[PDB]
Design an enzyme around this catalytic site. Sequence first.
Site, PDB file in Angstrom:
ATOM      1  N   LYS A  44       0.783  -1.116  -0.157  1.00  0.00           N
ATOM      2  CA  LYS A  44      -0.033  -0.202  -0.063  1.00  0.00           C
ATOM      3  C   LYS A  44       0.859   1.192  -0.100  1.00  0.00           C
ATOM      4  O   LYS A  44       1.715   1.378   0.612  1.00  0.00           O
ATOM      5  CB  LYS A  44      -0.874  -0.056   1.128  1.00  0.00           C
ATOM      6  CG  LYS A  44      -1.575   1.210   1.496  1.00  0.00           C
ATOM      7  CD  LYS A  44      -2.616   1.640   0.706  1.00  0.00           C
ATOM      8  CE  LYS A  44      -3.379   2.943   0.745  1.00  0.00           C
ATOM      9  NZ  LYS A  44      -4.396   3.272  -0.245  1.00  0.00           N
ATOM     10  N   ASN A 128       4.868   7.067  -5.725  1.00  0.00           N
ATOM     11  CA  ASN A 128       3.667   7.570  -6.103  1.00  0.00           C
ATOM     12  C   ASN A 128       3.494   9.267  -6.509  1.00  0.00           C
ATOM     13  O   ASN A 128       3.837  10.045  -5.299  1.00  0.00           O
ATOM     14  CB  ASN A 128       2.496   7.230  -5.101  1.00  0.00           C
ATOM     15  CG  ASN A 128       1.061   7.333  -5.459  1.00  0.00           C
ATOM     16  OD1 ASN A 128       0.723   7.887  -6.493  1.00  0.00           O
ATOM     17  ND2 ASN A 128       0.253   6.728  -4.699  1.00  0.00           N
ATOM     18  N   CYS A 131      -1.609  10.229  -6.308  1.00  0.00           N
ATOM     19  CA  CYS A 131      -2.692   9.960  -5.531  1.00  0.00           C
ATOM     20  C   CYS A 131      -3.869  11.084  -5.510  1.00  0.00           C
ATOM     21  O   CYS A 131      -3.427  12.281  -5.147  1.00  0.00           O
ATOM     22  CB  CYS A 131      -2.377   9.620  -3.904  1.00  0.00           C
ATOM     23  SG  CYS A 131      -3.914   9.031  -3.208  1.00  0.00           S
ATOM     24  N   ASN A 133      -6.946  11.510  -3.789  1.00  0.00           N
ATOM     25  CA  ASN A 133      -7.826  11.283  -2.799  1.00  0.00           C
ATOM     26  C   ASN A 133      -7.260  11.813  -1.410  1.00  0.00           C
ATOM     27  O   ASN A 133      -8.032  11.756  -0.391  1.00  0.00           O
ATOM     28  CB  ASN A 133      -8.409   9.877  -2.566  1.00  0.00           C
ATOM     29  CG  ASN A 133      -8.784   9.208  -3.863  1.00  0.00           C
ATOM     30  OD1 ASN A 133      -9.642  10.069  -4.408  1.00  0.00           O
ATOM     31  ND2 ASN A 133      -8.127   7.953  -3.962  1.00  0.00           N
ATOM     32  N   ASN A 195      -2.596   5.553 -12.601  1.00  0.00           N
ATOM     33  CA  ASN A 195      -3.330   5.620 -11.261  1.00  0.00           C
ATOM     34  C   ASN A 195      -4.935   6.003 -11.753  1.00  0.00           C
ATOM     35  O   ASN A 195      -4.978   6.115 -12.856  1.00  0.00           O
ATOM     36  CB  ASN A 195      -2.924   6.690 -10.512  1.00  0.00           C
ATOM     37  CG  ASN A 195      -3.389   6.301  -9.084  1.00  0.00           C
ATOM     38  OD1 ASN A 195      -3.063   5.268  -8.656  1.00  0.00           O
ATOM     39  ND2 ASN A 195      -4.005   7.352  -8.416  1.00  0.00           N
ATOM     40  N   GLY A 223     -11.414   0.611 -12.976  1.00  0.00           N
ATOM     41  CA  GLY A 223     -12.158  -0.611 -13.780  1.00  0.00           C
ATOM     42  C   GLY A 223     -12.234  -0.295 -15.153  1.00  0.00           C
ATOM     43  O   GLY A 223     -11.474   0.243 -15.822  1.00  0.00           O
ATOM     44  N   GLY A 250      -4.868  -0.677 -15.050  1.00  0.00           N
ATOM     45  CA  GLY A 250      -6.160  -0.006 -15.471  1.00  0.00           C
ATOM     46  C   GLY A 250      -7.041  -0.811 -16.319  1.00  0.00           C
ATOM     47  O   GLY A 250      -6.653  -1.203 -17.270  1.00  0.00           O
TER      48      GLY A 250
END
Lengths: 312, 312
Positions: A44, A128, A131, A133, A195, A223, A250
């Site tokens: 993670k 990363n 991100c 979020n 991402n 998805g 992806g």
Amino acid sequence: MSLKVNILGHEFSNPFMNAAGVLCTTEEDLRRMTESESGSLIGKSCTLAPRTGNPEPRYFGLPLGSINSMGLPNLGVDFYLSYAAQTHDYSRKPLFLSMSGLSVEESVEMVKKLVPITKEKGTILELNLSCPNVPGKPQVGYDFDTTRTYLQKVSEAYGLPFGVKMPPYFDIAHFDMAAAVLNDFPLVKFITCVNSIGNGLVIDPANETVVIKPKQGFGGLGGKYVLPTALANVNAFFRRCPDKLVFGCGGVYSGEEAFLHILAGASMVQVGTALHDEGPIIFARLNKELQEIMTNKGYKTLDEFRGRVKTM
Amino acid sequence: MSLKVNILGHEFSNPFMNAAGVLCTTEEDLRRMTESESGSLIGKSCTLAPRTGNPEPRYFGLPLGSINSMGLPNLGVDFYLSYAAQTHDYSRKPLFLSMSGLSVEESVEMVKKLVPITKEKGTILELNLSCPNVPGKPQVGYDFDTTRTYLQKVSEAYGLPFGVKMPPYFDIAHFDMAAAVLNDFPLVKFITCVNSIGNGLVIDPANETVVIKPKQGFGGLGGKYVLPTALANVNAFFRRCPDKLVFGCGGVYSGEEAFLHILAGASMVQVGTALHDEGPIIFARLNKELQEIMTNKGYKTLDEFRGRVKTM
Ligand SMILES: Cc1cc2c(cc1C)N(C[C@H](O)[C@H](O)[C@H](O)COP(=O)(O)O)c1[nH]c(=O)[nH]c(=O)c1N2
Ligand SMILES: Cc1cc2c(cc1C)N(C[C@H](O)[C@H](O)[C@H](O)COP(=O)(O)O)c1[nH]c(=O)[nH]c(=O)c1N2
Ligand SMILES: O=S([O-])[O-]
Ligand SMILES: O=S([O-])[O-]
């Protein structure tokens, strides 16, 4: 016939791994990924100190994929380092760690700690830069000056080959600008495309209410929504960054999507939403489905078609 | 219940219109849009001189939407102006023209010619800052300095209320930066969110070949792929630009998606891929479906719920 991949100095049994964020937060998660048929796994996206992430609900499964605003819940960098140094069974498969410090200063501190463990165990870094979020933290990869700083400082502090998780781009000029930055950092050996498609919005028509709580309902999309975007990014960087690997991420639900990612240039193929849906058994299914396509086409290795997508 | 929309002094029968690019290039196209049940219509994004557009194949219908790289095929600005001045039946419905000059100079020359026709007939301008399918012409909307120049020069040259077709944004900081530019231009009275998700790639697994010829297979995505992105953009600008209207475009196939767009903040709702698939008869269906939803919820007008999406 063989799904084997030889990159970064390792044999991978197959190209499949989890997407960072999915089935990789806890020790139990990582155990299940290691015991799966996956070719690899990635921890993670972590921060220097632990996080519990955003309030609930922060994940919603959709007919065409997923929307999430998890908020980088993670056990802190020391947990993942200790996993990498002591717990992980490298005889099973190689290990990646995703690191998502929320400042260059935080990232520098984190990757510095990874150096001895990479040297001892061979743990691989995915930095990363995407991100979408974390409230008040814009995607680094959409700012090329900020991206340059991160790559500069991580190159200096870490000093070993590493990879980057990029946000999706939607504009040829942005592919060009992103690649110009990436190509200035020879330690960046792989680019993971892509991402989540950031800051989408899902609304339930029945109750007229958004489906996740954080950020007024705004969340990263995964998805089926993202497959054409993901393929485009993979292929764009495959061509623009010939001295680097590309990993595809992806929209992978089956051997067919994996085949397309690899045809587009992917060395490894990461699985997020579908893995969240189906659990780690998916890797056994994906290996079988990919082999079936190869059988039907008369291919014996991935090398027979990786990056051989045809244009008109 | 009433589907009416009352904006810029005009009465629209319902919020529905074509998305620029679909069923609006030729006189016959525009006749068919005018004869449809749509509340309005918009002409193909035009250039000062005619264009034949990109080589074939350049359009591919998909299970989940569409990919295209048409390349702004258009009959030139004079054709659309002449349609607006002489041909269009304004008693049927109001008319928009989309203008997509590939330079600020070109856009200025075009909008000056529209001035007399807007004054005389009420023709409404949508300035296109988002086309992703012209080789060597990046999306203006992703460069905020360039966007500011276009809005400055077009505001000055046109001197009348107009709107802008924006590319999709995927980052909160970009919503903020885009809104900051838009809010400096009072003549920008509406924002259309969104144009295609730019530069996706579709590959046929059977022949290992991309499905469109231009730009090595890279094309704009429309349809089911774009709904969450579209809703997010609509809502983000609805909240950030209170002095302006927002038009929704993306992923509309039914009254349900239309309802969601309006709940997110949309005044007009544009239909691209679904209209390309079904023909203009779709508009009869969309009116019926939206009417049903409003009836079920006891909404007497669109104004009762426009922009009233609930958060947690
Ligand atoms: C629940 C959950 C959690 C996360 C993610 C996704 C999901 C579904 N994603 C994004 C992920 O890595 C991937 O890029 C996207 O999900 C797209 O791949 P799929 O289309 O979902 O296979 C993500 N990415 C990343 O680099 N670090 C992370 O911690 C997370 N967290
Ligand atoms: C064949 C074709 C042609 C065009 C388009 C699309 C398609 C399918 N689109 C994009 C369109 O206006 C719309 O923004 C997207 O298609 C998303 O809406 P849908 O999800 O398709 O309803 C488009 N947009 C625009 O502003 N000017 C144009 O000339 C075109 N041309
Ligand atoms: O942790 S990310 O999914 O917000
Ligand atoms: O004309 S646009 O569809 O490329």
